[PDB]
Subunit: 233 residues, 6 copies
């Protein structure tokens, strides 16, 4: 077992296919905070946080990463990158529980690029978010419609994140109409909706990453994850 | 942004008109505790605490200070001291939220003296408290009556705090009949009630300070303040 | 007052008749945790914890000890060891409150031996547990029946803890049918039930210890104890 | 074993004849600091500190206390108070080691009063300090002379500490001419010098306390004490 | 007094002309570290650190900033920006002491731009460093010569820092031939050497910032600063 | 990078061939301590500690493990267990630096068993220690002689560690006659000396583990390791 607390710390697991990532990307202008990632086993892991702030900015996204995350390449054995036109199933399973106050979510974050050689400075072209928990928060962009995908109902949002210099990505968010602590999803169901139903995503693009974590806007609490996997088949 | 954790630490803001004060005045005989003050912006600030104790003594009053607080003088630009007979409006606005357990309040603490040159050892003559939150607590002194002042209903209490050696002050507490997270008050409405309606306060006295904070008796939690000002007009 | 945080720390009180014990016996394979014991007075003491884990193993039993606990002997003035056949009253009083999440209990743990000279390596023969709080947990062994003892109703369980090498003890657990924050019990009522009603305990055995604490499986929180004593009469 | 870190925490030992005291009396106007007292056994105890400051004010005096220290009375079995005219031996033994930077001392602090019923607000009449270590520091008052007492050479200083309101005490400091890590002293040798040789102390006064600790002006480090006792015979 | 420990925290002082800055720019790929900035007064301030690493990368530059530092503008009253062709004196005074192990320096860092409206994304054109302490370190670029400027001898180095995308700055480092704890310097003496003696700097450029801090490569320790000012005249 | 601080935490590296181990085996009866293990890269790793105690007991052995350590089996790819009669080279390389006070060593710890299926409760038969640093410490057992092995001179000691119940192991310690920060050793040179020159070790035994770490008796400091490997060929 191990537990780490500095910015951008990584706890690898499953033969380095995944890592828990102490991602504090939104923290520069706030203080008073702490965030610790931990791994006891592959079925007992999570993170603990304290983000004292009332603002609507994301302070942090402690998370599990499979694939790329502004890294030189992709985690070993992850199955990323995978081109959408290859039509692989991207099967994910998670079971978790949160005890927290304030404003946060629990969400998948899926990154796409045009390149199959994403590196440390490769800006994504698109992000897909799948929120299993929304606690007092709301997504980027504008509400489109409610859809049934994968046996769940989702409110769909579409926006654009400007990352400076012409860098920036579409963001497509799927917010479950009620919170859930477990899901078994195929990311391909969501990318097929965006590509074939909405004509918002080209199948020439590559899925670079599947991440799962909690965006924290403010408050204190923790998550524990009791089941996790992402497999590209 | 900044966040500090030692006893009596001060985080100044608004051109040093105010400071957040890590006031732990009641802590000498307890242990196991911590208290951190933070300022991200003038609309995003607060404090976090842990006071493990069951007793009815106030352990701490983390707070924002305007004016005097056992200091050589008064914060710059605060407008203190102001003599009650000058009849200035003392307009205060606060919006806040607490997430905590145990026993605590959220309260204004207004200090008065006979002297307009209050220094580090000048014992006040009177304290006025205005409680916007009461969580399992109760004030000093005895219940007088319920009054409507400033558009709110308040239970009024009157007591006396003995500070040793003949030092000591009246304490007049106004406890809102239900908790609220925001208020816009004129302290003059409260001092006029005490002076003109109850004949308990001379208008020869000076208001030395307006403070807002949480008296903590026991438990753990935090406050965040999203709006704050005190202006003497 | 004092507050300590390392494994197996001890805070003695009442002329060393008792100690608060930072017992982390189940912690070897987990990380991310902390646990602090504190004593402000003999009527204001407790402990604070954070045990991030989903598993059904006991991580820790922060507790007050009277008597023996894998020590060379017994706390001074505790009245232990006492032979069951001497039929002494073992009167205990506790009042407490917990604020926590996760999975935990509040329980007496009473140790028995054949020897009246229990030492640091003397494996007990039996444990009796009396749970005043059960929060999402459950005991060792199998359910027997519900009984009224001492004015309370208890679900009774019987199991066996294997401690290796032939070492191991019976465990008899009494789980109150609803949680309570205070109790006045005579341990002799429980040992008489086990010995005379169930024929599960010989009165040749000695009571070595009476402990009270919280077994924590996972989560974060604290206890405060406002009344405590154990007296052998 | 135990280790505590809040202001004014106390770790009692030797049947409460002594306590280690987390004395931070000079800390109000500084920040960034920490101080922890610990006791593993009566021959393995000490404290650890960090006092980031360049100033000549004493920030803290972590110490062992026997007798009184602004308390209602005197530690049990200490032998205090003892009237100087009763001519008791006050035998002290200490062995210690410091590893630190900055500015500090290791010093006995002996308090005297006119009253044999010193209470929590009883201002002393005199202090005697016996410095076994001086690291970049210097005492209150003015240099008198160098004397041989008890087999050691001491630079003697005489000053007066003003504690406000007419409260205040003489301070007589004996600074060893070279540092030492161990000493066996009889306080009566020092009070006899002050009374009979210098005519600076009346034998009507009572010794209220013998304390040993490190005054820290700035820096970080620790002390460990391997032998300690004070006995009035 | 105050003391803060999160990345990029700021403690302003001197009417916000300066701030102490918890600058951890090189920390992304290391762990196990901490860094705290503190201010007791304008003559008693500093920082404490622990950077466990053997590598030659700068992990952090805790520092005092006057002027710009990837901010929207310049600190109030700093006197920045100032165009070199205006030939203002830029007088700096510092007195400090370090107690540390490992590899570090104590150095001024002076930033220049072509623009007098430097903003949060304005890459500098040049950096000038003035090292008062070198402990096991060495500068960027190549050694030029040893020069006497301002009454001190300096080893002069010239390099170029590539900041990506065409962004990047010359770096001119002046390393005192022996360490010193205090200096009174005029930055204009150094910019005149670079411009008029070496023809390496155009006087069309603006000085945007004067900073003083410790680049830490590895190790633990602290600095205390007892005198500080930067004035543009 | 990662850094962990709880007892028995593990940071695996090199495809789980090794782990850094937060081994605090001697800590039960002391307090005031902390110990953190960290890994930035395979050439930048180490640990930081604070063990306030004067006693001659080993408090902790933060270390890198290859092979077994009271585990069910041996680290993957370590090459353990290896039977001495197979005469494999066991080549080790380390380069490190310590900055610390107090009493400690830097030492290899090599464990042997009769069994090639060592499990979590398999008591070793022998330990071999190779001390590259001795700071105020001394080994178990009695001095034999000084020998030249592998190009270094070593003081050789022989003792026996009683682990209870008949469990216990020979301990053979080789203490370099002067400290060194780097070594390239073949463990077979040391086991051949013990077996063939001294007739103290049977070649039927298996090497189960090669560990390198710092036994800490007391004090505070850190190690950094810049090169590490153990290979069985
Ligand atoms: O160039 C220097 C080093 O760069 C490091 O990479 C950093 C990138 O430079 C950052 O852009 C990047 O930030 C992203 C962050 O990691 C994501 O988790 C976050 O995800 C958002 C997503 O954008 C959003 O659309 C969706 O709805 O929600 C998710 C989950 O929260 O996106 C961040 C992108 O930020 C850009 O766009 C938004 C603007 O507000 C922002 O200013 C833009 O930057 O982060 C990486 C990693 O480092 C940082 O994040 C983790 C922190 O712990 C760390 O402290 C940060 O530095 C490379 O890894 C290094 O190699 C380079 O040296
Ligand atoms: O003389 C040495 C240094 O004194 C410092 O001033 C301290 C005073 O000496 C204390 O009396 C004072 O305590 C008061 C505290 O700051 C207030 O917040 C508190 O407010 C109460 C109020 O009285 C009560 O009536 C109302 O209902 O609730 C409010 C909010 O909680 O009142 C305290 C007064 O205490 C006296 O009366 C009650 C008795 O129980 C008590 O024993 C009496 O003392 O505090 C100041 C500031 O320092 C202390 O408080 C803040 C802590 O963080 C710090 O550790 C404490 O020292 C000067 O500032 C220094 O310059 C002097 O050197
Ligand atoms: O031999 C080396 C040192 O031993 C120390 O004694 C330890 C014993 O060796 C451990 O067996 C013992 O663990 C017990 C623990 O302290 C109890 O609180 C716990 O109580 C359980 C009870 O068994 C259970 O039946 C009931 O329902 O719930 C209670 C309350 O939680 O029982 C533990 C017994 O563990 C054994 O059986 C179960 C197996 O899972 C386990 O592996 C077995 O060991 O603990 C003592 C004290 O030290 C340890 O516990 C406290 C921690 O803080 C510390 O870190 C641990 O070492 C001696 O005290 C030393 O003198 C010896 O040198
Ligand atoms: O009235 C409220 C509570 O008071 C508490 O008692 C405090 C006294 O009020 C303080 O005066 C006292 O401070 C003294 C300190 O404890 C001593 O260790 C120190 O010793 C000096 C000595 O004077 C000096 O002459 C010699 O050379 O060096 C020694 C060792 O360092 O003296 C302090 C006296 O301070 C007065 O005089 C000097 C002035 O600068 C100063 O302002 C004056 O006050 O301390 C006690 C104990 O509490 C405080 O100290 C320990 C801290 O941890 C704690 O945070 C502080 O409050 C009672 O104990 C309570 O019951 C009362 O409610
Ligand atoms: O765009 C997102 C946010 O950017 C923030 O500004 C950051 C810049 O983006 C970084 O380039 C900048 O890093 C510099 C750092 O602050 C300086 O102190 C350092 O100074 C060096 C100097 O270059 C060197 O030449 C000299 O010899 O030594 C000094 C003292 O150490 O230079 C850093 C420049 O880094 C670039 O070039 C070198 C490359 O290795 C590197 O990758 C390049 O980036 O830092 C600012 C401030 O934030 C960061 O630094 C402080 C940290 O605490 C913090 O965590 C970091 O983010 C804006 O302030 C935000 O508004 C933007 O949203
Ligand atoms: O049975 C319950 C759990 O046991 C765990 O294994 C522990 C063993 O039970 C302990 O005996 C073992 O302690 C040894 C320690 O890990 C070694 O590093 C140490 O090495 C010494 C060596 O003996 C000495 O001869 C040489 O000169 O120096 C080295 C380096 O310091 O030896 C310890 C052996 O201790 C025994 O003999 C000496 C007696 O004083 C002592 O009382 C005896 O016990 O440790 C393991 C691992 O856990 C413990 O150590 C690491 C700590 O972080 C942790 O907190 C401790 O529990 C199993 O791993 C679990 O699966 C079992 O459930
Ligand atoms: O998934 C994140 C998403 O939740 C966040 O939504 C923002 C949205 O972009 C913005 O337009 C709107 O003003 O605020 C949203 C967050 O606020 C909501 O949740 C928090 C509650 O406290 C609020 O009350 C509620 O309204 O957008 C970020 C991406 O942010 C980046 O792009 C947009 C910029 O405004 C930010 O500065 C960037 O960091 C998603 O990651
Ligand atoms: O505003 C504070 C006020 O709440 C506090 O009230 C005391 C009151 O003075 C006392 O008479 C009574 O016994 O206890 C009150 C606090 O208890 C209540 O709130 C906490 C809950 O746990 C309790 O159950 C509930 O009854 O008084 C302090 C001032 O205290 C000082 O003067 C009175 C002395 O008794 C104290 O020792 C002094 O510190 C207000 O600041
Ligand atoms: O008092 C402790 C008791 O609560 C614990 O019960 C175990 C029981 O022994 C085991 O058979 C069963 O599988 O799990 C019980 C705990 O789980 C329950 O509470 C926690 C919730 O999260 C679960 O959902 C709920 O089912 O037993 C320990 C003693 O444990 C030791 O003996 C049994 C072994 O399995 C352990 O490894 C030993 O440590 C009591 O102290
Ligand atoms: O034992 C303490 C004693 O060391 C301290 O000495 C002061 C002395 O009272 C003062 O006159 C002089 O200016 O400074 C002395 C301390 O400075 C010396 O040691 C620290 C080094 O950094 C300096 O360079 C060196 O000169 O006095 C205190 C008592 O202080 C109280 O009375 C005097 C007042 O000035 C203080 O404010 C009071 O707190 C002894 O406890
Ligand atoms: O002031 C910093 C300066 O000291 C640092 O010098 C580097 C130099 O740029 C590089 O060429 C050389 O390899 O290492 C120097 C540091 O090493 C020396 O000091 C540390 C000791 O441990 C070493 O033994 C000793 O040789 O350069 C940075 C700027 O760094 C940036 O540009 C150069 C890139 O290599 C870095 O990645 C960048 O961050 C100055 O801020
Ligand atoms: O490698 C460890 C070894 O250094 C330690 O040596 C002990 C030796 O066993 C004991 O006979 C002697 O009294 O003390 C040695 C340590 O003391 C020396 O180093 C520390 C300095 O402070 C001292 O001044 C100096 O003399 O032995 C342990 C193993 O210890 C176990 O067996 C022996 C028992 O006495 C212990 O209780 C056991 O833990 C080696 O791991």
């Amino acid at each position: 077992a191990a537990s780490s607390s500095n910015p951008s710390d990584k706890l690898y697991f499953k033969n380095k296919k995944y890592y828990i990532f102490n991602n504090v990307w939104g923290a520069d202008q706030v203080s008073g905070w702490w965030q610790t990632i931990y791994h006891n086993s592959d079925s007992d892991m999570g993170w603990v946080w304290n983000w004292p702030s009332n603002t609507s900015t994301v302070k942090a996204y402690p998370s599990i990463v499979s694939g790329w995350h502004w890294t030189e390449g992709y985690t070993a054995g992850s199955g990323f990158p995978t081109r959408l036109s290859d039509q692989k199933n991207i099967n994910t399973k998670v079971s978790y529980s949160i005890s927290a106050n304030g404003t946060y979510n629990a969400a998948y974050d899926i990154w796409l690029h045009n390149t199959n050689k994403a590196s440390w400075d490769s800006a994504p072209t698109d992000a897909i978010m799948i929120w299993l928990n929304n606690t007092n928060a709301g997504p980027a962009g504008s509400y489109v419609e409610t859809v049934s995908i994968g046996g769940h109902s989702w409110k769909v949002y579409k926006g654009y994140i400007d990352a400076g210099g012409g860098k920036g990505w579409n963001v497509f968010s799927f917010i479950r109409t009620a919170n859930t602590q477990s899901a078994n999803l195929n990311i391909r169901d969501f990318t097929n909706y965006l590509a074939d139903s909405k004509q918002w995503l080209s199948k020439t693009k590559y899925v670079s990453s599947v991440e799962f974590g909690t965006e924290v806007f403010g408050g204190t609490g923790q998550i524990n994850i009791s089941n996790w996997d992402v497999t590209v088949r």
